[PDB]
């Protein structure tokens, strides 16, 4: 699930979690949104909602990185931001 968010003066307008020691979900060290601010990029978009995981962002994978990388990649937005979200399914 990809979403083409346009970088605005305000910013992202939400929060995230990610990585060992700072994981958002047990068993998954991916980057998940923990709190979306009103009138924010995600909030306004509607596609991104609490519980989603960040597969990749700007060509980089956000599923095997620490929290620093989760924030560094979310903050690494120039004109546009290509967010890649993975669909949670699992086998077990």
């Amino acid at each position: 699930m990809e979403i083409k968010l346009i970088k605005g003066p305000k910013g992202l307008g939400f929060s995230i979690a990610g990585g060992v020691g700072n994981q958002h979900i047990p068993g998954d060290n991916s980057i998940y949104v923990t709190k979306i601010i009103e009138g924010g990029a995600a909030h306004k978009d509607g596609k991104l909602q609490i519980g989603d995981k960040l597969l990749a962002v700007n060509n980089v994978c956000l599923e095997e990185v620490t929290h620093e990388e989760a924030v560094t990649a979310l903050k690494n937005t120039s004109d546009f931001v290509y967010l890649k979200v993975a669909k949670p399914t699992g086998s077990h």
Binding site: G11, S15, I16, A17, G21, N22, I37, H67
Partner: peptide, 6 residues
Amino acid sequence: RRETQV
């Protein structure tokens, strides 16, 4: 666990 805003 750590949750930071961005």
